[PDB]
Write an enzyme that holds these catalytic residues in place. Structure first.
Site, PDB file in Angstrom:
ATOM      1  N   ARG A   1      85.199 -15.928  48.926  1.00  0.00           N
ATOM      2  CA  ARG A   1      84.811 -16.331  47.585  1.00  0.00           C
ATOM      3  C   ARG A   1      86.013 -16.728  46.737  1.00  0.00           C
ATOM      4  NH1 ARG A   1      82.479 -12.959  42.566  1.00  0.00           N
ATOM      5  NH2 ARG A   1      81.243 -14.608  41.553  1.00  0.00           N
TER       6      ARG A   1
ATOM      7  N   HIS B   1      86.440 -20.173  44.681  1.00  0.00           N
ATOM      8  CA  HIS B   1      86.785 -20.234  43.270  1.00  0.00           C
ATOM      9  C   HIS B   1      88.111 -20.932  43.024  1.00  0.00           C
ATOM     10  CE1 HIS B   1      83.926 -17.023  41.414  1.00  0.00           C
ATOM     11  NE2 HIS B   1      83.304 -17.852  42.231  1.00  0.00           N
ATOM     12  N   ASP B   2      88.964 -20.972  44.039  1.00  0.00           N
ATOM     13  CA  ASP B   2      90.230 -21.658  43.879  1.00  0.00           C
ATOM     14  C   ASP B   2      89.931 -23.149  43.936  1.00  0.00           C
ATOM     15  OD1 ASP B   2      92.856 -22.434  43.725  1.00  0.00           O
ATOM     16  OD2 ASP B   2      93.362 -22.013  45.799  1.00  0.00           O
TER      17      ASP B   2
ATOM     18  N   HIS C   1      76.766 -16.760  51.423  1.00  0.00           N
ATOM     19  CA  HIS C   1      75.971 -15.624  50.981  1.00  0.00           C
ATOM     20  C   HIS C   1      75.273 -14.966  52.163  1.00  0.00           C
ATOM     21  CE1 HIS C   1      75.679 -17.396  46.631  1.00  0.00           C
ATOM     22  NE2 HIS C   1      76.877 -16.919  46.917  1.00  0.00           N
TER      23      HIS C   1
ATOM     24  N   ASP D   1      72.422 -10.767  51.909  1.00  0.00           N
ATOM     25  CA  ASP D   1      71.615 -10.982  53.106  1.00  0.00           C
ATOM     26  C   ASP D   1      70.981  -9.675  53.571  1.00  0.00           C
ATOM     27  OD1 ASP D   1      70.512 -11.493  55.562  1.00  0.00           O
ATOM     28  OD2 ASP D   1      72.250 -12.522  56.379  1.00  0.00           O
TER      29      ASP D   1
ATOM     30  N   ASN E   1      84.591 -15.050  37.177  1.00  0.00           N
ATOM     31  CA  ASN E   1      85.602 -14.216  37.823  1.00  0.00           C
ATOM     32  C   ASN E   1      85.718 -12.809  37.261  1.00  0.00           C
ATOM     33  OD1 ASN E   1      86.696 -16.031  39.793  1.00  0.00           O
ATOM     34  ND2 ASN E   1      87.717 -17.131  38.131  1.00  0.00           N
TER      35      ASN E   1
END
Ligand code: HEM
Ligand SMILES: [Ca+2]
Ligand SMILES: [Ca+2]
Length: 306
Positions: free
Chosen positions: A38, A42-43, A170, A222, A70
């Site tokens: 993640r 996000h980077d 996810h 999941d 974040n």
């Protein structure tokens, strides 16, 4: 042009050092692989994969760590510091934080049981962080499918396959109750649960996330294989068991004519999903990188070199 062999001469053991770090950390924190993947996402969605997200506050610019997507959510930063230090010892001032995080994401996926591949390398580190851009570019769980598509297109990922495949992240990891409270008790101001949420699963989720309960409580993305990286995420969607709104919309949105067949294809075949995931991951990792002499090779991922 990014290339998988970028460090084969300057730091041949970088991938192995990163792997070792994640393996050790996983023993005390089984969630770290998901968290690291993640971080890479996000980077890349904010000014490209330039390790901008790893920077801490300075008096001139705010950290992306305080972005809505974040703050009190993103994690694993100390682990990245650890592998960075180990890599700096093996090959001083050689591997950028941007590349380190990319390798860390790939190794995390592989360690969790996902596909194994060599990520393109040669990215360099940003000279600043982008908080406002992070708030504008990171997608939210309440986004409609058109909004999700727009968010990906905004950073350069035009294909619905990019969206459906990457959403597969996810297949593991955790989600706070806060992000599904509307689906469970009052969706779209109806006073009723999201009709696209399987009613049996609805009961289970209500038990984990009661109204007026701890919104920070964590639930598995999941329900089939909480910590294994596989295609079970898609099987869940086909049964209306996607955890968050953005998950289920890939299969249930009125605008899902193009994503439904992709969800089915990935649910029907692990190889099809894994292939698409790698292709999408490399495309995301190719978003506006700094290369050559642009940016720097950060020594401490939290600060710009001085
Ligand atoms: C399509 C839009 C997406 C939305 C709206 C979304 C939303 C979310 C939300 C709400 C959380 C829970 C955060 C928390 O509880 O603190 C989360 C976690 C996570 N997301 Fe996504 N996500 C998206 C795409 C992606 C992509 C592209 C990846 C990576 C390929 C990814 C990987 C993860 C992982 C692994 C976690 C769990 C992290 C952990 O447990 O530490 N997400 N996401
Ligand atoms: Ca970035
Ligand atoms: Ca799984």
């Amino acid at each position: 042009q990014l290339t998988p062999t970028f460090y084969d001469n300057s730091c041949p053991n970088v991938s192995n050092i990163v792997r070792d770090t994640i393996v050790n950390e996983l023993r005390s924190d089984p969630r770290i692989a998901a968290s690291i993947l993640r971080l890479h996402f996000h980077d890349c969605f904010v000014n490209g994969c330039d390790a901008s997200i790893l920077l801490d506050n300075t008096t001139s610019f705010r950290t992306e760590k305080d972005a809505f997507g974040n703050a009190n959510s993103a994690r694993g930063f100390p682990v990245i510091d650890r592998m960075k230090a180990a890599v700096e010892s093996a090959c001083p001032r050689t591997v950028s934080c941007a590349d380190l995080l990319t390798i860390a994401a790939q190794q995390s996926v592989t360690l969790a049981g996902g596909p194994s591949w060599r990520v393109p390398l040669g990215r360099r580190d940003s000279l600043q962080a982008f908080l406002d851009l992070a708030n504008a570019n990171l997608p939210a769980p309440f986004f409609t499918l058109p909004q999700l598509k727009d968010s990906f297109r905004n950073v350069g990922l035009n294909r619905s396959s990019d969206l459906v495949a990457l959403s597969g992240g996810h297949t593991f990891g955790k989600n706070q109750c806060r992000f599904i409270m509307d689906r469970l008790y009052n969706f779209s101001n109806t006073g009723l649960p999201d009709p696209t949420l399987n009613t049996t699963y609805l009961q289970t989720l209500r038990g984990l996330c009661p109204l007026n309960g701890n919104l920070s409580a964590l639930v598995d993305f999941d329900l089939r294989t909480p910590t294994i990286f596989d295609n079970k995420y898609y099987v869940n969607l086909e049964e209306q068991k996607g955890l968050i709104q953005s998950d289920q919309e890939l299969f249930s949105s009125p605008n899902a004519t193009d994503t439904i067949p992709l969800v089915r294809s990935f649910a029907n075949s692990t190889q099809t999903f894994f292939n698409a995931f790698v292709e999408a991951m490399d495309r995301m990792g190719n978003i506006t990188p700094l290369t050559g002499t642009q940016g720097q090779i950060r020594l401490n991922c939290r600060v710009v070199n001085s």
